[PDB]
Symmetry: C5
Subunit: 103 residues, 5 copies
């Protein structure tokens, strides 16, 4: 079991870590058919998504995806500093896999 | 995959991108028979709803609707500035499809 | 579709609007068998309940009832001003059908 | 229909009202096997639990149990004054049936 | 029934209490496959996880796992002082079974 976001991120193919150390600049949410998703942006121009849950994803996956959207919304609204994001680069915008917060 | 609310809204028919750059003026919620709606209003007069899901709604759609109503209530309570809304304009009041928050 | 709580409230029999423009004074909740209800009070003496759903209540009603208890709890804790309540006056305490919040 | 916590408490056997008029001193929660419970304490030494649900417990009661733990956590975190607690005194520690919050 | 985290923790083998009396230094969350988990750390170098749910986990166990993650996030964001943690010490990082929060 990884004990940090960098090592967790490295367990997967087509991932990379972004180190932001900054609050979220914008939060976008859609319930539109086939776009049940969330997009956040940082003031440096970086844009990321929380991907739509897939065709019958398992229970743990669907719960974590909803948890991550919960987390980004509350982080944005409270101006909580985001330390790092682990994202999949085979999507556009890059898709969030994990987030770390410190400070 | 759209990277912002304007491009997302343009992927659907019968939608309008609506710019606000303002906090929600009032939040209304109902639990009454087939009116389990949320209504939000803004200072300059605009009025929007989160439409009640019908009897064929799939799980992903129901979950996203529930999420949006959560988002509107917390945005309202925190006086978070709403940048834009993407709304369906063939219903009255217009029905929210997406929301962007910034500033 | 109604565009404000007054007009929504008027679509039902045995309802009425109360205009509080004040924060909630007390919040009560129970998990006791058959009384899974919430009761709120205002400093002017008014008392209102969120009625227990019955054994035939469909899922969309149940979810709205739970949402309203969530809303009342968070308003109470944050001292958010309640503008109006739409209530059924054929129950005691009067039963909440809808709520509006505005500064 | 009870209009307050005291009257509601009186509808059940093996209950009593505690009048704290104080914020929660400590919040404890467990996910351990057979002990999926919450414990709260006050500065005067009183200790109460949110009981583990029974095997037969129906959905509405389970939902209310989960709600009460939500309530105690946020009451604790916001230092919200707890007015009264309705508890079952045939358990140890005494188990929460209802709570009232007021200043 | 245990009346405090220390006694609760002693009911299980391979557990220990950490007395931290300190806020969480960092909060990490992941939705990645096989890694639906949360990791918290303290400024003394202690690192803890909320284990990935088991594929056959019962309902009460799954909900408590979800609740614990909700608690850790809100404790983190509000700088709530964590009093003690009850952890399974046959996991690496040590896995949270119970948390106590006090002032
Ligand atoms: O679990 C979700 C992941 O699924 C992978 O197969 C895909 O490459 C990633 O982009 C991400 O979507
Ligand atoms: O939907 C709940 C409402 O249902 C009505 O039929 C009843 O008259 C009201 O008192 C309220 O209970
Ligand atoms: O509904 C929960 C309550 O159920 C009663 O039967 C029991 O006597 C109480 O101790 C409490 O467990
Ligand atoms: O219930 C969760 C616990 O399950 C036990 O079997 C295990 O030994 C502990 O380390 C922890 O995983």
């Amino acid at each position: 079991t990884p004990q940090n976001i960098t090592d967790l991120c490295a367990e997967y193919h087509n991932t990379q870590i972004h180190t932001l150390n900054d609050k979220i600049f914008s939060y976008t949410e859609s319930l539109a058919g086939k776009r049940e998703m969330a997009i956040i942006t940082f003031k440096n121009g970086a844009t990321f998504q929380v991907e739509v849950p897939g065709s019958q994803a398992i229970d743990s996956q669907k719960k974590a995806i909803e948890r991550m959207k919960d987390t980004l919304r509350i982080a944005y609204l409270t101006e909580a500093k985001v330390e790092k994001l682990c994202v999949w680069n085979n999507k556009t915008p890059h898709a969030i896999a994990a987030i770390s917060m410190a400070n």
